[PDB]
Amino acid sequence: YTPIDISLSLTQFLLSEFVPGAGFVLGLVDIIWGIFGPSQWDAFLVQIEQLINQRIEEFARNQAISRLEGLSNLYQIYAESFREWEADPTNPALREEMRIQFNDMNSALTTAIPLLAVQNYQVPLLSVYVQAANLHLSVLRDVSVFGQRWGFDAATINSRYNDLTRLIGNYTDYAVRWYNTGLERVWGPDSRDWVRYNQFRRELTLTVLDIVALFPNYDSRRYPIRTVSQLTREIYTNPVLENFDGSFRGSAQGIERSIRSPHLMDILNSITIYTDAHRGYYYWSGHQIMASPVGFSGPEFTFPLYGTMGNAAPQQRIVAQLGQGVYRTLSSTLYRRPFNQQLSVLDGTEFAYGTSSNLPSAVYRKSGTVDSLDEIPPQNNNVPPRQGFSHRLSHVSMFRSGFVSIIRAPMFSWIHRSAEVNNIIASDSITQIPAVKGNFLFNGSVISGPGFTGGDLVRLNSSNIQNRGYIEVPIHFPSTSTRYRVRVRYASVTPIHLNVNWGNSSIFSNTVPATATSLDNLQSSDFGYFESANAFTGNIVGVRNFSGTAGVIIDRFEFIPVTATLEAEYNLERAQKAVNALFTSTNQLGLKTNVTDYHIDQVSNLVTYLSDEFSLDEKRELSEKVKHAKRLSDERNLLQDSNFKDINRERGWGGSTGITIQGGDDVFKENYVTLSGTFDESYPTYLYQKIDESKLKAFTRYQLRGYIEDSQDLEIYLIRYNAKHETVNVPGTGSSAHHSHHFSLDIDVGSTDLNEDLGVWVIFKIKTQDGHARLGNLEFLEEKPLVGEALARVKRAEKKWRDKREKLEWETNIVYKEAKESVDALFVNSQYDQLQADTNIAMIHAADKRVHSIREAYLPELSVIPGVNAAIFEELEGRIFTAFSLYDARNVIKNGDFNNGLSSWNVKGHVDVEEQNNQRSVLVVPEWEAEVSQEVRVSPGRGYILRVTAYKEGYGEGSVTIHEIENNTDELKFSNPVGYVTKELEYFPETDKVWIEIGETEGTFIVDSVELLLMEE
Amino acid sequence: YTPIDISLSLTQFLLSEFVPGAGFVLGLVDIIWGIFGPSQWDAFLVQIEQLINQRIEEFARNQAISRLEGLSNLYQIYAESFREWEADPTNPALREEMRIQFNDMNSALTTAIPLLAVQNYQVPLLSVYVQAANLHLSVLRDVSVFGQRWGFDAATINSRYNDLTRLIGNYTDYAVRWYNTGLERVWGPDSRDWVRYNQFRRELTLTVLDIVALFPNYDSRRYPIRTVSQLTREIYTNPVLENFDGSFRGSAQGIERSIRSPHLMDILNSITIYTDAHRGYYYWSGHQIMASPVGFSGPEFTFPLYGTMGNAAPQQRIVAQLGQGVYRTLSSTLYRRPFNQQLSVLDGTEFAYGTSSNLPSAVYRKSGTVDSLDEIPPQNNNVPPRQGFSHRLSHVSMFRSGFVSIIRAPMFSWIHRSAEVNNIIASDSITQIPAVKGNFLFNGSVISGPGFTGGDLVRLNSSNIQNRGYIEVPIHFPSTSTRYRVRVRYASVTPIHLNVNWGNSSIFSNTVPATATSLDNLQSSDFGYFESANAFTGNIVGVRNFSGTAGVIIDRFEFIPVTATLEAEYNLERAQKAVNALFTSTNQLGLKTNVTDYHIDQVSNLVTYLSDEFSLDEKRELSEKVKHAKRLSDERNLLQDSNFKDINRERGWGGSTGITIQGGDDVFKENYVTLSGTFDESYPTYLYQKIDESKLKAFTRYQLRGYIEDSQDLEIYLIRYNAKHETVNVPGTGSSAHHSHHFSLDIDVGSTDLNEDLGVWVIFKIKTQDGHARLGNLEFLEEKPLVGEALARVKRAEKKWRDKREKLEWETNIVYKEAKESVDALFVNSQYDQLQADTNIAMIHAADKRVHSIREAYLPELSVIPGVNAAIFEELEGRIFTAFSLYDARNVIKNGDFNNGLSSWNVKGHVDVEEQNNQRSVLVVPEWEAEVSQEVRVSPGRGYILRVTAYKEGYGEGSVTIHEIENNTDELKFSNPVGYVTKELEYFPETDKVWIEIGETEGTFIVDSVELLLMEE
């Protein structure tokens, strides 16, 4: 019969029937607006006014009640019109009437609510304010569903939808704010203050917060179908204190502390009660509580003894989880306060259970007349209290004092019955399980709700790895066969990566957005949602806070029944949006330049995951477009042989050993490239390609880019007017150092000239042993035309390369002449047939060094790439290689150069042949006892030239001598940056054998070549 | 017929029959020692001498061959004795002969090997050295298995077992070292140098490394039963280069680079060959290779074109994976070298396949007579080459030059056939899969093996989280029903945490030891093992490097068939060792003091995981002991109610609200405690307990300790002579900040005195809101007696507390007297019946402050704990509370104190009642227009005293006035750190009603109390 009774009846309706329709519209009239007079509105104001002890100003109060009246009358019209329209949807008069009534309803409300929020009296007005706002939200939510069907145009529906969500927030934040400051205003130091304080809290939770808690569910778009919330907050009664005919000083903090702080929800299993005695008055002195987690999903637990052990009588375990729990307490109080020792306790209490039928009430000692049901009344008056109660007993703590006065004041928590002992998932509606109904909290806290949630929330803390915040909720599924998408309501001040598990499998893991800008004063719009992409049928549900850095508030888990067509639709929209975002324009004719080749690959992946069972028509369509995008990417890609199909087959890819092409990957979806290291720095692993001038456009930046799975020591070159080069090390990822796998590199074209034919060299190099790379999706592309500084830089670069060429082209005319003449002086001039008789090796070597002083025969960066001067260097060095060949053939001495180490030589001591300047091999005689010798056949009577090219380290003299058996021995002697002397002599063997013998006196002797030749002109 | 043929025949035996027994002993004689003369040993030396071009010194060489001979003769005796003993194990003569022959065999070998390792010629001796060492290891491995059965005593078997493992390392490191420096010694700049170089490498891999690679398997204890290894190394042939009748200058680096660097193993699928033409000579100009990963577990891949495309003739795909792969190439070479252009290529090659039957050979163009089978001969000569080959063709790369001379020199990799195309797991032997046979390498490299592994290894790099190094190997199980323990051979320089997965499940995750002290020059003993604890029956196998910091080399995976009894045994030993390590001594009578209660809990967990099917007898036994340990822990534990069964039931645990006891946990196995925060700092969450002097021993340190799952703001107190206190924050873990969950805290006892009864207070406190702890397994224990500094510190602490008491005990005699007299002055002296007529509130308040200047009525740290002065403070404050009660009852004014705010008062303006010093409530008149008034009933004719206690802020005068209707109004006026004035007057009502009215002129007026009293003596 009181506002709390009325609220609880709305609360039940809102929990059980929350779904757009005539049942809803009709529900509000029957419960409230159709059946309330001005005395009912008066009654509501008095409830809070009495409490806070100050009445609303009369004009304001008068204004308030006549508005509420205006609205009863209005809404009755809207409801009656709604009803009739429902019965005949197509009747245009019934529809116009719907439109008009809606408009008028929206006017009145917008105007009347500010009059229920009037300064200085916001508090005593709140619950009624809450009423008008609950109603405002539903008409807005109506028009957003039925608007179209009534004849409103989309423009006007979205405007009023935007209003709807603007106002879920506003109205909620308002109520919550004034509840707070009303609550604080009524706090005070004594037990009397506490009674008013708690009574405020309890009454206003019942007529205010509970409704507000349901306000989100008006979001038609978030909650298209029936959606069931659960209120988990606790409310408190305290018999002893609540009708103590006095007040205990400075006790209200002590009393308030005897309420349990924020916890995971638990079921009250039993109370075991201790009787003590004072002047032959027997009383409840202490007691003990057992409890279980939600869903008896854990073992039971307990708490330290409340109050004090007593032994005046046996003790009495009262079991609470029988039927549906305890819904009522009838308590006997005792106050002995004899004229002058003092007593304030309970001598008995009945605990009564909720049942669809009947259960004997468990009595501690005796019943009494301090009925809890005055304070926590039933929600349903169509049945006995045992059936129609609103609350279950949740815990019984205690405020105590001890040995001048005795206080034993048991404190009763009542949780709302919408808080089910188990977490059962429906299948025809969205089910809301608040995270607080969980049973495993690792690295995080429960912290009291701000009022607009129905209860407390879960904080998961920031990390690092094995310290991830985690909340686990047990959940039962009546219907196995039902497919659900999970949605989570959360709050964070930063974007956080979150993983949601279901059973042992992880159904969501990505970074969700921020929603707030501080987690301390939490406002309605501070919360948000995310959902799994798919829908499924394990038996628990969980969230993990992956962030090392920030925390996250988890409100509630939401299970959303879904058909397979719905599923296929969600993913289609998602993928359709992806493909479209590749193109510049609405006609899909061009790619956005900053869309990379690899990106187009990620997006195509999305398409192939679409159902073949429900989306084929519209999936094929999408795959047309993404293939089309890709084709356009290949069009803009200026590199030949993109997929490395023809490396080395010259005008495509140039490549070395230590490369590998596999077709695909964890990362790559197309042919890609693996490069491994080298054992010698001079023999690098290289993939290169020239880009033809004819494909380039003047005065334009170009961009080399691609994707590297991972990398170490990867050397990347871009070469036109000069070479730029990155070294690139990129670690892999799972699912100095580059944090990104995308790379890019820019170069700028000046004037293009086909005749000069610069182009752009693209070169990938690895010159170390540990060393590697995995890359693909390589593009070379046109980016932007050159403007401002970049332009003047390029003009400077070309101009500067232009000046470097002229220089080079001048110095090369000198040197070539010089080298070419030195080359010619080696030969008998008759076209590369013969060496002059008297040209020696040092000469060949000297000519060689004049050839190798040619500066751009080969590109510095990678010397397999011919330079400006490749043509002319090449011909001269071949004339040189011819020359060494001729030197060798004519030498009557086998291996006189030491080019084959020591073969064809007879060696006595310790001697070595070491290479010194290019292929050039030298004999080292390190000690005088060593002897290198060769027997040579000759033509007796002919004449020979013995030529030695060598030098002498240190003291003494090096010798090459020559002889036959007995008298005919002759000698070449050497004594004294690194340069050789050439000596010779004429020898005339008497016989058919000669001996050549190399030796020395001391120090070290070094011989380049020993030659023996016929004198023949 | 050559040493390479002989080696390959041993190699096959060692791969296929590696198992202790007579088959093994008999195998070595038949293959080697029983059938070799001195010419065979000569032959071996010549193989390497010819190669390195320098013969061994004659004495050394002579010595060497006669030792090898001594050993042929000896081992023939040992083998014949082994054989005969096998046939009749119990015959004591056959057993004595076994013992003797073993001793002699061990002597000869120990003496002869140093003569095969002689300075200056270690290299040319190596392979023969390898032979003698292979043999040494097996006799050692024999005696370690059969030793006991021959009659050797355990002392001598373990000595020779220790020798065995000492020498697997030594002999391996030796061989490997000299292979290295022999190989380097023979490197050189030209193609000729390369031929010798590679020929060395290839021949010495075949006669040396391969054997050495098998050396570990001699570890009887690691390999109790048959164990099969796989050689994965590649060897190389190069037809063109290998019988080029000359040498190409500075080409050996170029040639060497045409060998593939370290890779995951792959199967050669096909070669597709390009014919070109030069002067109407048709040649192999280029070619392309396809390959697949091991087990065709991946898609195929390819490589950039080898050589150069040619079009002189069609092109020719030759398929390699037919039969068992290509085992042979017969190659035609071409050398045009016309007197003066140059050519060095192949004009044809036959590829022949390995089959149990027959397959036509695929011919490129034509066969030739450069048979690969001269270089890579068969292992089995009991069958045609097609069946008995040792190698499969593995890859064909190329060394090239191009457009003076042309070189097209295809390079053939041969992998040993023990490298199976698939990774098949046997069931009757241990199967060794080298990690290199994997198909997924993430964050790591393959790097060339050191020689003693059979092939290359896998490096997994240091991290951070989604960059864990990982190696995945595909594996087939012929027999589903077989149970295997996985063992991994690895190397690391630090202890690393490693996770091994099998299929999708993770079968090992813990930190394994270091084995090495640098990963660069890897020695035999640098490797180690770890194993899963259990044994299982997924289809791949993997290791992940969990370290953020260090790298790890993975060699090979080892699968070990096991029965269920074996399993149950492994875990029993493991748990038996755990339980024993709890006790001080061999009689399990005492606990080791540094074994914590929680530790005993971890160890009991280990016991409950033992099989009930195979271990019951010996598991029950173990559970007796661990329960016994635990019982002893409770014995030493000096805390009452360890498992928090009786908190608050006073002489056990003292506890507040916001505590919870659950029975067990992810962490705790026994009753444990959860504390949550507080809303007010003055109302903390507390668990405390005193420890009785009678349980303490003089001059001894004690230790408080326990385990905290997690914690924040946990305040821990230890109190005797003074209080020490930690604040403790401990993050949780998965499976300022404390990195450990174990805590401890120490205190020291001086002299114990039962009369003074200090004890030790143990207090857990949380005084903040965010704030929590989860702890259990709490012990208070005796640690050690006090010695040295600690002793003199404690003597100082007690002495100092002793001096603080005397002080306290002196000051308390003064104050108590003072306070007690002030208390008494309040009363009419007749036992606490009445207040003196003229004692006012300020007096009561002044007396109160003299009571509350009592210094240790309550323990500072937690004021629920009575102090020295709790008794005397308590009585006096009750006399005070009596006094306030009396003040109130006699005041004819209702609520004249403002202790119930403003009730019983009529208020006109804005006025407030604020609490100021304890419960003391004051009326604040802030403005002159305000009016607080009360109508009081009186007895006409009697006489009353109107007393006011108040003061005046600022200007003007505060008034309390009193009156009846018309002429009888009188007044108390107040004008002018925080202290009150008391005024009064005598009033005599003519009527039955009086009015009391509080007011003021301006400024602010503050009233403590207004009292009206009858004058009655």
Ligand SMILES: [Ca+2]
């Ligand atoms: Ca030379």
Ligand SMILES: [Ca+2]
């Ligand atoms: Ca007062």
Ligand SMILES: [K+]
């Ligand atoms: K906020």
Ligand SMILES: [K+]
């Ligand atoms: K152009």
Ligand SMILES: [K+]
């Ligand atoms: K090492």
Ligand SMILES: [K+]
């Ligand atoms: K004692």
